[PDB]
Amino acid sequence: PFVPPSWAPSVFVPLTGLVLPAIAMATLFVYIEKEAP
Amino acid sequence: WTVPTLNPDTPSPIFGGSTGGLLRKAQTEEFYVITWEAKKEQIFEMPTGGAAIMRQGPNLLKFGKKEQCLALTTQLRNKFKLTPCFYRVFPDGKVQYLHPADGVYPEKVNAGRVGANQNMRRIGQNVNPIKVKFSGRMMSPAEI
Amino acid sequence: GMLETPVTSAPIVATYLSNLPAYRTGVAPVLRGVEIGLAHGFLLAGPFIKLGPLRNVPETAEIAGSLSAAGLVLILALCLSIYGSAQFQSTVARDPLFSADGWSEFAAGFLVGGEAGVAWAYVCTQ
Amino acid sequence: ATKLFPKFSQGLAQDPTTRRIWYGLAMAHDFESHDGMTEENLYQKIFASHFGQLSIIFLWTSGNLFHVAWQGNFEQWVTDPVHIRPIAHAIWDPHFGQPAVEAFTRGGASGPVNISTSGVYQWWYTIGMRTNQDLYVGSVFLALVSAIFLFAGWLHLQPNFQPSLSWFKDAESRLNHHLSGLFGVSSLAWTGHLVHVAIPESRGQHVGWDNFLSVLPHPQGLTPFFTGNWAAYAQSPDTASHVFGTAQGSGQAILTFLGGFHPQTQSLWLTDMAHHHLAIAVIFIVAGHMYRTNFGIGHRMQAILEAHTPPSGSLGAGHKGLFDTVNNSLHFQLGLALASVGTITSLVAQHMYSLPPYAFQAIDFTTQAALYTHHQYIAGFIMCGAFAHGAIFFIRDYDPEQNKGNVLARMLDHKEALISHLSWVSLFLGFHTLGLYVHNDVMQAFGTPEKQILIEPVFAQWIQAAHGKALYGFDFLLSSKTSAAFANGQSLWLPGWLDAINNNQNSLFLTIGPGDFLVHHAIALGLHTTTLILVKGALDARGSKLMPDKKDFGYSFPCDGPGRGGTCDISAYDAFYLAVFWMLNTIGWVTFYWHWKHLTLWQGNVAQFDESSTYLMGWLRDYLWLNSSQLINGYNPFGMNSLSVWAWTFLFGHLIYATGFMFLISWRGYWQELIETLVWAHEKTPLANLVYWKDKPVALSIVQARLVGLAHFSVGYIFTYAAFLIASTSGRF
Amino acid sequence: AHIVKIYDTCIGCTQCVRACPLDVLEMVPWDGCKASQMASAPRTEDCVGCKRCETACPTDFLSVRVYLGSESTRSMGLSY
Amino acid sequence: RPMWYPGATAPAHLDGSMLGDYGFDPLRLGVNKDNLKWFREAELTNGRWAMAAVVGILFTDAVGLPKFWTAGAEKYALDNQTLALIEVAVFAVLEGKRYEIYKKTGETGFLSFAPFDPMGMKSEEMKLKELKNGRLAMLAFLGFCSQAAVYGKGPIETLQLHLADPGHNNIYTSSVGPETAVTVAVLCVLPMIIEATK
Numbered sequence A: 001p002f003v004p005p006s007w008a009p010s011v012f013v014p015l016t017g018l019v020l021p022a023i024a025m026a027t028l029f030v031y032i033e034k035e036a037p
Numbered sequence B: 001w002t003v004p005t006l007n008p009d010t011p012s013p014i015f016g017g018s019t020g021g022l023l024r025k026a027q028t029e030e031f032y033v034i035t036w037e038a039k040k041e042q043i044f045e046m047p048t049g050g051a052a053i054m055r056q057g058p059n060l061l062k063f064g065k066k067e068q069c070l071a072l073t074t075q076l077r078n079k080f081k082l083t084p085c086f087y088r089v090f091p092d093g094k095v096q097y098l099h100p101a102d103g104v105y106p107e108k109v110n111a112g113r114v115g116a117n118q119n120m121r122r123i124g125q126n127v128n129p130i131k132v133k134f135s136g137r138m139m140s141p142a143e144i
Numbered sequence C: 001g002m003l004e005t006p007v008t009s010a011p012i013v014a015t016y017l018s019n020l021p022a023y024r025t026g027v028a029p030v031l032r033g034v035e036i037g038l039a040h041g042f043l044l045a046g047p048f049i050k051l052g053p054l055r056n057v058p059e060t061a062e063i064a065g066s067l068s069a070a071g072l073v074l075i076l077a078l079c080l081s082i083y084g085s086a087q088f089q090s091t092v093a094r095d096p097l098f099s100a101d102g103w104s105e106f107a108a109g110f111l112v113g114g115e116a117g118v119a120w121a122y123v124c125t126q
Numbered sequence D: 001a002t003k004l005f006p007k008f009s010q011g012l013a014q015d016p017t018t019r020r021i022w023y024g025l026a027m028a029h030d031f032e033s034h035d036g037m038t039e040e041n042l043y044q045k046i047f048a049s050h051f052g053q054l055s056i057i058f059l060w061t062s063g064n065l066f067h068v069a070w071q072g073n074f075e076q077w078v079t080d081p082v083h084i085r086p087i088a089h090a091i092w093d094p095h096f097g098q099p100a101v102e103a104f105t106r107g108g109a110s111g112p113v114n115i116s117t118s119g120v121y122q123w124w125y126t127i128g129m130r131t132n133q134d135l136y137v138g139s140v141f142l143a144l145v146s147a148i149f150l151f152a153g154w155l156h157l158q159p160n161f162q163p164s165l166s167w168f169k170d171a172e173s174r175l176n177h178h179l180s181g182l183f184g185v186s187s188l189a190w191t192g193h194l195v196h197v198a199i200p201e202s203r204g205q206h207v208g209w210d211n212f213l214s215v216l217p218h219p220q221g222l223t224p225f226f227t228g229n230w231a232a233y234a235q236s237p238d239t240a241s242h243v244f245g246t247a248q249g250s251g252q253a254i255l256t257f258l259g260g261f262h263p264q265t266q267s268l269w270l271t272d273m274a275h276h277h278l279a280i281a282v283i284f285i286v287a288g289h290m291y292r293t294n295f296g297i298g299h300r301m302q303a304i305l306e307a308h309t310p311p312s313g314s315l316g317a318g319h320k321g322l323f324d325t326v327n328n329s330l331h332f333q334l335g336l337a338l339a340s341v342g343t344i345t346s347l348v349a350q351h352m353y354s355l356p357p358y359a360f361q362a363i364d365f366t367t368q369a370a371l372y373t374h375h376q377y378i379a380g381f382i383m384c385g386a387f388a389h390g391a392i393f394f395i396r397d398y399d400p401e402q403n404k405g406n407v408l409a410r411m412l413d414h415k416e417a418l419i420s421h422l423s424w425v426s427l428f429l430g431f432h433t434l435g436l437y438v439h440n441d442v443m444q445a446f447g448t449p450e451k452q453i454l455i456e457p458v459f460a461q462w463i464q465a466a467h468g469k470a471l472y473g474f475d476f477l478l479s480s481k482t483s484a485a486f487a488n489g490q491s492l493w494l495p496g497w498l499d500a501i502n503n504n505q506n507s508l509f510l511t512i513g514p515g516d517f518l519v520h521h522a523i524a525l526g527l528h529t530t531t532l533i534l535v536k537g538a539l540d541a542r543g544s545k546l547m548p549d550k551k552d553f554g555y556s557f558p559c560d561g562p563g564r565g566g567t568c569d570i571s572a573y574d575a576f577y578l579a580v581f582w583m584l585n586t587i588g589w590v591t592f593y594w595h596w597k598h599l600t601l602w603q604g605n606v607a608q609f610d611e612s613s614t615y616l617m618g619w620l621r622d623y624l625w626l627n628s629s630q631l632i633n634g635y636n637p638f639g640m641n642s643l644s645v646w647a648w649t650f651l652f653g654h655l656i657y658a659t660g661f662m663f664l665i666s667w668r669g670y671w672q673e674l675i676e677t678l679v680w681a682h683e684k685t686p687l688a689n690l691v692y693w694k695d696k697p698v699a700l701s702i703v704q705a706r707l708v709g710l711a712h713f714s715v716g717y718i719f720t721y722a723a724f725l726i727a728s729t730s731g732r733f
Numbered sequence E: 001a002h003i004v005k006i007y008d009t010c011i012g013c014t015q016c017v018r019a020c021p022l023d024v025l026e027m028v029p030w031d032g033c034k035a036s037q038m039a040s041a042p043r044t045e046d047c048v049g050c051k052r053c054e055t056a057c058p059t060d061f062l063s064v065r066v067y068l069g070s071e072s073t074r075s076m077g078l079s080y
Numbered sequence F: 001r002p003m004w005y006p007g008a009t010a011p012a013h014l015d016g017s018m019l020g021d022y023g024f025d026p027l028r029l030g031v032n033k034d035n036l037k038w039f040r041e042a043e044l045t046n047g048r049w050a051m052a053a054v055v056g057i058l059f060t061d062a063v064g065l066p067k068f069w070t071a072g073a074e075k076y077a078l079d080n081q082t083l084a085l086i087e088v089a090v091f092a093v094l095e096g097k098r099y100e101i102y103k104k105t106g107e108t109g110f111l112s113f114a115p116f117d118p119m120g121m122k123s124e125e126m127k128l129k130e131l132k133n134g135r136l137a138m139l140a141f142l143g144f145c146s147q148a149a150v151y152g153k154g155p156i157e158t159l160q161l162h163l164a165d166p167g168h169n170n171i172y173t174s175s176v177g178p179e180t181a182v183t184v185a186v187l188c189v190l191p192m193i194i195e196a197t198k
C-alpha cells in the first residue's frame, strides 16, 4: 500500500527540520575544525 | 658587519597608548620589534594611530605585523633620515633579524646576495598551462 | 602600548568579574557549569513564557515557555559540547576548564544546571 | 595547525582563516585543481559523480510521484481535469494560524495543501497513469533505480572495477551506443509503452502488468508489420467526438500522423506521438552504426575531421588536429554539451507552449506559464555555462602547437573582428530599440498615439503565412489552395495542422504586430549582448593588451592590481559574471513578453497587448502594476487568503536581490577593516574572550564576493518573478 | 605563499624594491643590463600580494610578476 | 576467531583485543582509539539497560499488568511532576559517580564502588557474556517496540500469534513487508559486495 500514517508529517517534518540538521551541522562543524595529525 | 642582537631592556618612545596595538597573536604566534637611534627628541606618527615622541638615543617598539615595522622604517628614513632595524620575536623568546637582512638596505645592490626566484627568460616565453597540467597541485607556467 | 581607562581598570569591576564563576580558576568545571546553567535557565524561562505564541491561553503559557526554554538549554549544551570538541584537540596556573575533559564536564554541568534552572523557574511562578 | 578539511587541497588546509571553509566548499568539484590528480583518476571521479547525479535525479522523481500518490488528488483530477486543481503535497507547519489553515485547505483535500504548477498531473494522465497505485509503484521502482545507480557509483571506484583511461576515450564506441541504444532503443521502448499502454488507456481500456501480455495493441496483431502493410496501423483513428479516457468515439489505429490537436484535450494525438517516437527511434538506431569500433566497417572521426579542409585555404588547415583537442579536453566536451542542451531546453519551452503534448495542459494557464519560464531560465543558465567552459578550455586545455592553422587557431587570429562586430550589432539594436520605445512613450504621453513608429513584422508574418495562416492574406505555399506543397499534404497531415494554426484560441503561431516586432528586437539585443560578453571573455581569456599573460593566472583570479590604469574584472570568470546579469535580463524580457501576450490571450482581450506593448509605460502599468494587485493583497490588515505565500515570496525575493546589491557594490577593504575592529572588540571583552574562534575571521575574497552577490541577485530575481507569475496567473484564472 | 618572479627584461632601476611595503625584493649583482643589477625575491614568505612592485616596474611587459598562491597569516596581512 | 559473516576481514583497528570482536565497523566510527573505549562503555551500559528493560517487559505480560507502552498513562500513588524531579536529582549524583569511575578505572560501577561485585564472579568470560547478552537484549527491545508499533498487543502475544501460522504471520506479511523484504535481500547481497571489492 505504501501509505504512511496520519501522524507521519508530525514526526518527519520536525525531524528533518530540527533534529537531522542539528546533527549534520554538529558533525560537519567537528569535521571542519579537526586538526590533522 | 655582524647581525645585531635584540636588547629587550631598551626604552620605548613616549606614547599614551592606543587600541590599535598588539593582540592575542603576539602572545600565541609572533610579534615584531623595531629599534632605532634618534639624534633628538621628536614627535612622529605611529603606524597604529596617534602621535608618539621618540627619545634621544635608542628606541624600541612592538607591532603585530612586519608591514607596520616597515612603514615606520620608511617614515623614519624619509623624514628624520634615521636607520631603523627590526626583528621577529616568537613567544618562546627566539629573535630573528629581518631588515636590513644583510646590513645594507635592499634598494642598493650589495655583494654576497644570491639571486632568488629569477627566470632567465621573458614573460612571452612562458609555456602554456596545458604543459603544466596534471602536476602535483595548481601550478602556473611561471613556476617552472 | 594599550589604552587604559577607569572602566577597565577600576578595582570594583575587577573584583566583580573575579567573583563570577567563569573567573574562579580553581573549582571543578562541572560546578562552574551547574552554576552558570542555573543562572541562565532561570532568566531564559521568562521570554518564552511571557511572549510565546501561547502566552494568552491560561494554564499552558508557563508549560510551553518552560518547555521552549528547556529546548534552548539543550541546544546550548550541544553547542558547548561541539565547541569543546573543536577547540581543545592537542597540547599563574593553567585553568583545567580549557581542556577537552574540562570543557566536556563543563557542558554537562551546564546542561544539568540549565534544566534545573528552567524547572525551578517554572515552579516559582506557581 | 593543518586542518583535515579540505582533503583535496593542502594549501587550503593550511589556511588559518575562514576563507578555508568557503574555498573548500567552492573548489570541491574542481577535480583538475586537486592535489595529486591524474587523468585516469579524473575520469574515474567524473564517472562516480555522474552516477551520483543520476541517483539524485531518480530519487527526486520518485519523491514527486510518492507525494502526488499520497497527499494529492490524482484519482479525482482524472475525473474532472478542467475544474479541479492539482495538489502538489500536504502542508504541515506549526507556525500556521487558524486562518492560514483554512486558507490553504483547498482542492478537495482534508487539510492545507499546495496546488502543483509543474504539470506532472497532465503528463502522467496522458502517458497512462489513472490510480494512486500506479504512482506508488512507479515511485518504488524509481527509488530502486536510484539505489542501483548510487551503488554503481560506489562500485566503480573500488579496485577491479575502475575503468582505464583508454576506455573513457573510446569516442566511436560511446557515440555508437548513445545513438543506437541510449537514444534509439529508448525511443523504441517508449513507442512500445505508448502503443501498449497510453493509447489503450486513453480509449478506456486498462492495460497494466497483469494483462498486457493478453491484450492486443491492434486487432490485426503484428501481421501488417511483418507483411509490410504498415498502412493498416493508421486505419480507423480517433474521431473528433472522442472522449479522453473513455471508449466513446475511440478508434483502433496506433500509428497516425493526423496532425493538429485533439478536439477535447487540445493536445497532440497519442497515435501521432507514438508514430513520432517510432520514426526517430529507427533514425537514431540507424545513425548508431556510423563509427568504426571493432568490425572494420564504420568511420573514424579523426579521418572525417582531417579530410574536411577547403582547397582554397579559406579555413587554413581546416579541422586538422581537432579530434585530439576535443577528445583530450573535457572542458571542450562540456561546453559543446551545455550549448546543445541549452538550445534544446529553449526548443522544449517553445514547442511545449505552442504544441501542448499532454492532455488538458493548455487550459492550465499557471502550468503553461511556469513551465515556459522554468525551461527558459534553465536554458539561459546552461548557455552561460557553455561559454564559461569554452573560456576554461582556452585557458586550461588549448594548445596552439597542436592546433596550428586550423579553424580553432583562426578564431583567435581574428577575435578582435568578432568582438567589434558583436559590439556594433548590440549597439545598433540597443540604440534603435530604445529610441523607438522612447519615441512611442513620448507620443503616448503627448496624447498623439497615431504618431508613434509601428513597424509591421512582415517577415515573420510572411513565414506564418507560409505555414498556412491566411489572416495576413499572402496566399502562398500552405496558405494557397493551389500550391504543390499544399496539395501534397492534404491527405496526410495538413487538414489538422491547418485547422489548428488558423484557430486564434490556441498558442500555435499567435498573431503578431508592431509590439511583437519591438520586443523581438529587444530579445535580439539581449542575445547579442550576452553573446558579446561571453565570446569576448572566452577569446580574451588567454590574454589581451592589458594583460598579455592572463593565461598564466588561471581562469578565475581577483585582478592584476591597480597598476596600468586599473585591472578590475579582467579575468574570464568576471566576463561570465557580467554576462549572467545580461542573461537574466534577456530571459526576463522573453518571459515578460510570453506572460503578457498569454495573459491578454487567456483574458479574451488581445487588443490590450497589441495597443499597450508598443510603449514601455504600457508594459509597466498594464502588465506589472495591473497584474500585481491580487499578489500584494495576499495578506493585508483585514486578513489573508491562500495567495499570501506568494506575497511573502515576492517580498522574500526583493530582499534577497537587495542583499545581493550589497556584495555587488561595497567591496572587500571596508569589510576587512570593520572585521579587524570586531576582532579587537571580541579580544578585549570580558566573559566573552574565554571563547575564541578556530579560524581567523576575514572578509570574503573579491571572487567570492562577486559569486555571493550574483547568487543573491539570481535567487531574488527567480523567486520574485516566480511568485508574481504564479500568483497573477492563478488568481486571474 | 604568493609566487614572485623576476624576468631577464629587468633594467635594474630598483623601483620595485623601493615600492615593496614588506621587504620582499632586493638587488643582486648582474651583467645583463647597463645598471649591472637585477631584482630578486628571497623573502617571498612575507609577500602579501599588493602588486606595488608591478605598478613600479617600467619595462613592457613587466619584469616582476606576483601570482597569488596559498594564503597564510603573513600573506593575508593579519595582525591578529 | 569468527567474524560477522563467513569470510570477513578486520578493518585494521579491530584486531581482537576487545571482547566480542567480529570485525564489524563499516562506518569506521571506532577509528579513534580514545573513542573506542567510550563507545565500548556506552555499548555496555546500553546493553545493561536493555537487559533490565526487556526482562521487565517480558515479566509484565506474563502476570497480566498493563502494557509497556501504556504503563505511563496509568495513575500511580505519586505525582508525575515529583517523579521527574526525584529521577533527575538521584541520577545526577549517580551518573556523576559513575563517570568518575570510568575516568579512574575504565569500566562501569555503582556509587563509590568501581568494581561493584559483592559476590565476586568478575571473570574475563563473564565480561564477554554481559556484552553478548546486552547486544541480544538491545535487539530484543528494538523488536518489542517494532512489534508493538505495527501489531500492538504484546511480545508474548506476538510469539503466540506466530505459532498459529508461521508461514502466514511474519514481518513480510505485515504492514512493513516489502520494505523489510528488500532490506533482507540487500543485506544478503552485502557480504558478496564487500568480498567482490576487498
Ligand SMILES: CCCCCCCCCCCCCCCCCC(=O)OC[C@H](CO[C@@H]1O[C@H](CO[C@H]2O[C@H](CO)[C@H](O)[C@H](O)[C@H]2O)[C@H](O)[C@H](O)[C@H]1O)OC(=O)CCCCCCCCCCCCCCCCC
Pocket: B138, D009, D010, D011, D012, D022, D023, D024, D025, D026, D027, D554, D555, D556, D557, D580, D703, D704, D707, D708, D710, D711, D714, D715, D718, E068, E069, E070, E071
Ligand atoms: C542545489 C545545489 C547547490 C546547493 C548549494 C547549497 C548551499 C550553498 C553552498 C555554498 C555557498 C557558497 C560557498 C562558496 C562561496 C564562494 C567561496 C569561494 O571560494 O569563491 C571562489 C571560488 C574559488 O575560485 C578558485 O580560487 C582558487 C584560489 O587558488 C589559490 O589558492 C589555492 C589553494 O591554496 C592555490 O594555492 C592557488 O595557487 C591560489 O591561487 C584559484 O584562483 C582558482 O583559479 C579559482 O577558480 O570561485 C568560484 O566561484 C567557484 C564556484 C563556481 C560557481 C560557478 C557558478 C556560478 C553561478 C552563479 C549564479 C548562481 C545562480 C543561482 C540561481 C539560483 C536560482 C534559484
Ligand code: CLA
Pocket: A004, A008, A009, A010, A012, A013, A016, D059, D060, D061, D062, D063, D064, D066, D089, D090, D091, D092, D143
Ligand atoms: C528528493 C525527493 C523528496 C523531496 C524533495 C521530499 C520532500 C518532502 N517530504 Mg518526502 N519522501 C521522499 C522523497 C522526497 N520528499 C521519498 C522517496 C519518500 C518515500 C520513502 C518520502 C517519504 C516522506 C514521508 C513519510 C514524509 C515526507 C515528507 C516531506 C515534506 C517534509 C520535509 C521532509 O523532508 O520530510 C522528510 C522526508 C523523508 C524522511 C524522506 C527521505 C527519504 C530518502 C530516501 C532520503 C533522501 C536523502 C537525501 C536525497 C540526501 C540529501 C539531503 C541532505 C544530506 C543534503 C517535504 C515537502 C513529510 C510530509 O509529508 O510532510 C507533510 C512526511 O511525512 N516524505
Ligand code: CLA
Pocket: A013, A014, A015, A016, A017, A018, A019, A022, C048, C052, C053, C054, C063, C064, C065, C067, C068, C069, C070, C071, C072, C074, C075, D094, D095
Ligand atoms: C524547519 C523546522 C521547524 C520546526 C518543526 C519548527 C517548530 C516550531 N517552531 Mg520554529 N523556526 C524554524 C524552524 C522550525 N520550527 C526556523 C528555521 C526559524 C528561523 C526562521 C524558526 C523560528 C521560530 C520562532 C521565532 C519561534 C518558533 C516557534 C516554533 C514552535 C511553535 C510554537 C507552537 O505553537 O507550539 C507549542 C510549543 C510548545 C508546546 C513548546 C515546545 C518546546 C520544544 C519545541 C519541545 C522541547 C524541545 C526538544 C525536546 C529539543 C529539540 C532540540 C533538538 C534540535 C535537539 C514549534 C515547535 C515558536 C516557539 O519556539 O515557541 C515558543 C517561536 O517563537 N520558530
Ligand code: CLA
Pocket: D046, D047, D050, D051, D054, D167, D168, D170, D171, D173, D174, D177, D178, D180, D181, D182, D183, D186
Ligand atoms: C546501449 C548502451 C549504453 C547505454 C544505454 C548507456 C547509457 C548511459 N551512459 Mg554509457 N557508455 C556505453 C554504452 C551505453 N551507455 C559504452 C559502450 C561506453 C564506452 C565507450 C559508455 C561510456 C559512458 C561514459 C563515460 C558515461 C556514460 C554515461 C551514460 C548515462 C548518461 C546519463 C544521461 O545523460 O541520461 C540519459 C540521456 C538520455 C536518455 C537521452 C536524452 C535525449 C535528449 C537529450 C532528451 C530528449 C528526450 C525527451 C524529449 C525528454 C523526456 C521528457 C519527459 C520524460 C521528461 C546513460 C544512462 C555517463 C554516466 O556515466 O552516467 C552515469 C558517462 O559519464 N557512458
Ligand code: CLA
Pocket: D025, D026, D027, D028, D029, D030, D031, D334, D338, D381, D382, D383, D384, D385, D386, D388, D392, D555, D556, D573, D576, D711, D715
Ligand atoms: C553539466 C554542467 C556543469 C558541470 C559538470 C560543471 C562543472 C564545473 N564547473 Mg561549471 N557552470 C555550469 C555548468 C557546469 N559546470 C553552468 C550551467 C554555469 C552557469 C551558472 C557554470 C559556470 C561556471 C563557472 C564560472 C565556473 C564553473 C566552474 C566548474 C568546475 C569546478 C567548480 C565547482 O563545481 O565547484 C563547486 C561549485 C559550487 C560550490 C557552486 C556554488 C553554489 C552555487 C552558487 C549555487 C547557489 C544556489 C543557492 C544556494 C540557492 C538557494 C536558494 C534558496 C535558499 C532560497 C567544474 C569542473 C569553475 C571552474 O572551472 O574553476 C576554474 C568556474 O569558475 N562553472
Ligand code: CLA
Pocket: D423, D424, D426, D427, D428, D429, D430, D431, D434, D525, D529, D532, D533, D578, D579, D581, D582
Ligand atoms: C538600464 C541599464 C543598462 C543599460 C542601458 C545598459 C546599456 C548597455 N550595456 Mg550594460 N549592463 C548593465 C546595465 C545596463 N546596460 C548591468 C546591470 C550590467 C552588469 C554589471 C551590465 C553589463 C554590461 C556588459 C558586460 C556590457 C554591457 C554592454 C552595454 C551596451 C550595449 C550596446 C547597446 O545596446 O547600445 C545602446 C546604448 C544604450 C542603451 C545606452 C543609452 C543611450 C542613451 C540613453 C542616449 C544618450 C542620451 C542623450 C542623447 C544624452 C544624455 C546625456 C546627458 C548627461 C546630457 C549598452 C550601452 C556591452 C557593451 O559595451 O557593448 C559594446 C558590454 O559588453 N553591459
Ligand code: CLA
Pocket: D655, D658, D659, D660, D661, D662, D663, D665, D666, D674
Ligand atoms: C536589503 C539588503 C540589505 C540588507 C539586508 C543589509 C543588511 C546589513 N547591512 Mg547593508 N548594504 C546594502 C544592502 C543591505 N544591507 C547595499 C545595497 C549596500 C551597498 C550600498 C550596503 C552597504 C552596507 C554598508 C557599508 C554597511 C552595511 C551594513 C549592514 C548590516 C547592518 C546591521 C544590521 O542592520 O543589523 C541587523 C541585520 C538586518 C536587519 C538584516 C536582516 C536580518 C533579518 C531581518 C533577520 C533574520 C534572522 C533569521 C532568524 C535568520 C534565520 C535563517 C534560517 C535559514 C536559519 C546589515 C546586516 C553595515 C554593517 O557592517 O553593520 C554594522 C555597514 O557598514 N551595508
Ligand SMILES: CC1=C(/C=C/C(C)=C/C=C\C(C)=C\C=C\C=C(C)\C=C\C=C(C)\C=C\C2=C(C)CCCC2(C)C)C(C)(C)CCC1
Pocket: D331, D332, D334, D335, D336, D339, D340, D343, D386, D387, D389, D390, D391, D393, D394, D538
Ligand atoms: C567558446 C567555445 C566553444 C563554443 C561554444 C558555442 C559554439 C556556443 C554557441 C552557439 C549555439 C547555441 C549555436 C546554435 C546554433 C544553431 C544552428 C547553427 C542552427 C540552425 C538551423 C537550420 C539549418 C534550420 C533549418 C530549418 C529551418 C529554417 C526551419 C524548418 C526546418 C529546417 C531544418 C528546414 C566550445 C565550447 C565549443 C569550445 C571552444 C570555445
Ligand code: SF4
Pocket: E006, E009, E010, E011, E012, E013, E014, E015, E016, E017, E038, E039, E053, E056, E057, E058, E059, E062, E063, E064
Ligand atoms: S621595477 Fe622592474 S625593471 Fe626595475 S628593478 Fe624591479 S623588476 Fe627590475
Ligand SMILES: [Ca+2]
Pocket: D128, D130, D201, D206, D207, D208
Ligand atoms: Ca492501468
